[PDB]
RNA sequence: AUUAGGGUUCGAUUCCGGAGAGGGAGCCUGAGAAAUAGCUACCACUUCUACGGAGGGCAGCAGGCGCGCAAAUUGCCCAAUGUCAAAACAAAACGAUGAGGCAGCGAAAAGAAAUAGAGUUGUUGUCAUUUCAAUGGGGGAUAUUUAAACCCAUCCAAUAUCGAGUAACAAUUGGAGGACAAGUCUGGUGCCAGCACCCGCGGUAAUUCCAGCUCCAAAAGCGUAUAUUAA
């Protein structure tokens, strides 16, 4: 039968590896939501990471790839525990710091790339870059 | 092999007579090949004769193997 | 002369116009397998000795 | 261009298209277990006919031959674990005489209407495909699921489902949402 | 009777290959006499353009006109006859129309009581035929 | 691919090897080329011009024109996979890459699967009623996915989240003499229209044409043509 409770959010850690070469801690992330309504927030799942493994700082703490499992009440990804939040920004790819807030503004397009520089073939001296 | 003809100089054309399998027929048929094989003035061989032959580098457009042996 | 060229469709042209009659929808998929299932097999106790007819028509001329 | 997916066909059709003796068989089959068409007898009749291969190849070979001894015990723990045949019967002879109604019983389909968790086969069927019955604790939607003899107590009505531990379903949380707005 | 020698692979190999030329469908198909013929030049289907209409007499012991249409068909201006089948179809069909030829059925031999026609007319205006004569579609222009 | 076995047949096409860059032939550079988004010439075509001249090579990607029975977007991205390189990442500080990947188009082919399920009463089964629950298609999101999107997957409160009754959210494609599953049915045409792969049907009571009804077969598929394998 039906019994109305508040939704609870379990973090599961699994082939939990510490690879000192890039100052991390690499694990697989399982998420048990019984009654959750929908999917659980990358951010609200760091939040609970951070604390059960005690980090200083919630945001050095990268998760990605999460993928819902059929039938619901569970999820699986896989996430990151870097040694400070220096380390973060220094390793982590380019996308993955653009959904945490800090990333590099995106470049223009490719294509008008491309015409500068087939337009730059005709020229000589000093005229590129004008 | 054996020694086909001997009207070249230095040179003879041996023949290696075998079986071909045919595996639909589940039978056999005779096939040959010839080599022209390049003689030493050591061993005189004869029309008829059987011979042991190695390979060696190309001596002309057509020799690729010569005499070791006479039987 | 041989024949007419013309006279093509005469009786496609000849026929009169019925009209088809509206009919309620039938069950589509496996609730029509289970009709089907329901008339051949469980609507009727098979009697040896006479074949079973599935569109039997009546009598006429 | 350059993808390596494989795939596969899992059935085939009848050689002669309008034979009366085999149309009626296959038409008892489709209404006894509720199925949806005849593809899913001849995904079955596919299945039947790659084991009885594998098996007559077996039984050429002498009882000590290693492909014998390692495929053959195989297949027998296939039969087994699925439920196609008995524990009992232990000899390659049994799995050639495999009919496919054996198989039929063991789709989820059959199995749930058997179990009780459903009042008829077509009852199972639509039960299924509307998330209502968890294997081991897990939704299936597959009406084709072979169940196994080792995961069939564990068939049950799924925990999200109205009938199991879940809310309500869609009549009654409109009707109560209508119920609220009429206000 | 045969040879039955375990040397003798060469004899039948050769007896094979001589034979099985009086196989007529084996020989129609390693020989280029069927498709140099062909109208179509092995294809299933070939486009090309009414000429006139005509019709066509059933054979003894059948009494019809059978409606068909003179076609010259684009890709090598060959004059072929195609059949137009179904009821009234024919009006479907006017002078220097597109249309879409077949065979009809037999693999270039005639087909029931029309003499010696094996093409049948498919589409019309790049429309079927069939499904203008259901009125499924209209004919453009 | 098809095959009890033996065989028959296809292999332009993802990997390996070869060959070519409109046609031919030469050649420089270099470890490696007889290179072609390198050079030279000729033959075919062809573009710009102020008429003196100067150019061009999609059998790379996308896209045009033709050709045909016949085959998609002049899209997004270097996130992954790799290559090159003077090159880890990061810090004023982001290498290129139509190779490749991702989407669009796509009933080639392949897998899973809806179009309903339980009853009540009236008329063992059907039918007229009559309720009852369920669920997707779909619409949405604290969001998830993704390089970014889009698909899946999750959810319709966790205090607090849209929705089937003609469930109109309405299944088709071919057939009903024989081969070959299914009508002595009812109208309409009279060897005409037409059907018919073959045998045949139609010349006034058509089991075969054109139709309505009913029924059969396969079913989100189903006919037809041409090849090919079995038969
Ligand atoms: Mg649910
Ligand atoms: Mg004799
Ligand atoms: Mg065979
Ligand atoms: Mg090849
Ligand atoms: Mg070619
Ligand atoms: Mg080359
Ligand atoms: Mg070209
Ligand atoms: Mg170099
Ligand atoms: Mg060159
Ligand atoms: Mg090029
Ligand atoms: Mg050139
Ligand atoms: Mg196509
Ligand atoms: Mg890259
Ligand atoms: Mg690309
Ligand atoms: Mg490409
Ligand atoms: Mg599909
Ligand atoms: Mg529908
Ligand atoms: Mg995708
Ligand atoms: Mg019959
Ligand atoms: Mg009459
Ligand atoms: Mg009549
Ligand atoms: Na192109
Ligand atoms: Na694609
Ligand atoms: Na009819």
Redesign the interface.
């Known amino acids: 039968v039906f019994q109305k409770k508040k939704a609870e959010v379990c973090i599961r850690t699994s082939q939990f590896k510490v690879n000192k070469l890039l100052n991390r801690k690499q694990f697989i992330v399982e998420v048990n939501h019984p009654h959750w309504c929908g999917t659980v927030p990358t951010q609200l799942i760091r939040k609970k990471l951070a604390t059960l493994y005690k980090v200083p700082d919630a945001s050095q703490v990268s998760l990605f790839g999460f993928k819902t499992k059929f039938g619901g009440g569970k999820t699986t990804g896989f996430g990151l525990i870097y040694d400070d939040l220096a380390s973060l920004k220094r390793f982590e790819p380019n996308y993955r710091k653009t959904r945490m807030g800090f990333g590099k503004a995106r470049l223009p397009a490719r294509k008008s790339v491309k015409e500068r520089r087939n337009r730059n073939k005709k020229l000589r001296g000093k005229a590129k870059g004008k | 092999g054996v020694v086909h003809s001997t009207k070249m100089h230095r040179t003879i054309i041996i023949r290696r007579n075998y079986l071909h399998f045919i595996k639909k027929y589940q039978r056999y048929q005779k096939r040959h090949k010839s080599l022209a094989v390049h003689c030493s003035p050591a061993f005189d061989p004869k029309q008829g004769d059987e011979v042991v032959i190695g390979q060696c580098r190309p001596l002309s457009k057509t020799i690729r193997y010569n005499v070791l042996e006479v039987v | 002369i041989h024949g007419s060229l013309a006279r093509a469709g005469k009786v496609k042209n000849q026929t009169p116009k019925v009209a088809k009659q509206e009919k309620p929808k039938q069950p589509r998929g496996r609730a029509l397998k289970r009709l089907k299932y329901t008339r051949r097999f469980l609507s009727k106790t098979v009697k040896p000795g006479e074949k079973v007819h599935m569109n039997k028509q009546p009598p006429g001329k | 261009m350059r993808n390596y997916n494989n795939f596969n066909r899992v059935w085939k059709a009848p050689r002669r298209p309008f034979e009366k003796e085999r149309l009626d068989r296959e038409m008892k089959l489709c209404g006894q277990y509720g199925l949806r068409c005849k593809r899913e007898i001849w995904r079955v009749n596919m299945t039947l006919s790659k084991m009885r291969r594998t098996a007559r190849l077996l039984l050429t070979l002498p009882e000590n031959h290693p492909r014998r001894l390692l495929e053959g015990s195989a297949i027998m723990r296939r039969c087994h674990e699925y439920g196609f045949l008995d524990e009992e019967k232990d000899k390659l002879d049994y799995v050639l005489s495999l009919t496919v109604p054996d198989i039929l019983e063991r789709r989820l389909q059959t199995i749930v209407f058997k179990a009780g968790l459903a009042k008829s086969v077509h009852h199972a069927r639509v039960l299924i495909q509307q998330r209502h019955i968890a294997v081991a604790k897990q939704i299936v939607t597959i009406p084709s699921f072979i169940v196994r003899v080792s995961s069939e107590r564990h068939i049950a009505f799924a925990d999200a489902s109205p009938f199991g531990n879940g809310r309500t379903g869609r009549v009654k949380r409109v009707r109560a949402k209508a119920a609220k707005r009429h206000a | 009777t045969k040879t039955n020698?375990?040397?003798?692979?060469?004899k039948?190999?050769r007896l094979r290959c001589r034979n099985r030329w009086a196989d007529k469908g084996w020989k129609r198909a390693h020989t280029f006499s069927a498709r140099k013929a062909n109208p179509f030049g092995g294809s299933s289907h070939a486009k090309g353009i009414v000429l006139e209409?005509?019709?066509v007499?059933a054979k003894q012991p059948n009494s019809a006109?059978r409606?068909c249409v003179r076609v010259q068909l684009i890709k090598n201006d060959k004059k072929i006859i195609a059949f137009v089948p179904n009821?009234?179809?024919?009006?479907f069909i006017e002078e220097n129309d597109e249309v879409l030829v077949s065979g009809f059925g037999r693999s270039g031999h005639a087909v029931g009581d029309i003499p010696g026609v094996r093409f049948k007319i498919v589409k019309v205006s790049n429309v079927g035929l069939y499904a203008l004569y259901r009125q499924k579609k209209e004919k453009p222009r």
């Open positions: 020698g375990q040397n003798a692979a060469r039948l190999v209409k005509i019709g007499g006109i409606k009821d009234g179809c024919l009006h």
